[PDB]
Design a protein around this motif. Structure first.
Motif: not given
Length: 49
Positions: A36-41, A44-45
């Motif tokens: 999930k953290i990877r997905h938000l990052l 955003k990218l």
RNA sequence: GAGACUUGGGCAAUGUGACUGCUGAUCAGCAGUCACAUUGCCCAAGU
């Protein structure tokens, strides 16, 4: 993003080698939140990309 | 001298047949040796 990718494989191997069901579940939750953290990052990218 | 016939000493090969011996590689079983990986524990330090 690269560090979180490395954390993906670290949690994958620790989950694969874990034995206690509680430890298995905890590793699975850690990996899921890592995704999930990877997905938000990356989302955003990419909107900027 | 002309010769036929036989055993020899052999010289040749055209066959063909069988014997014996060895090397090498592969697999399987067993035994042993090198390194390497994983989960731990503990310690040594430096800031």
């Amino acid at each position: 993003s690269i560090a979180i990718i490395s954390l993906i494989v670290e949690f994958d191997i620790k989950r694969r080698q874990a034995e206690t069901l509680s430890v298995k579940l905890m590793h699975r939750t850690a990996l899921t939140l890592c995704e999930k953290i990877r997905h938000l990052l990356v989302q955003k990218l990419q909107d900027m990309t």
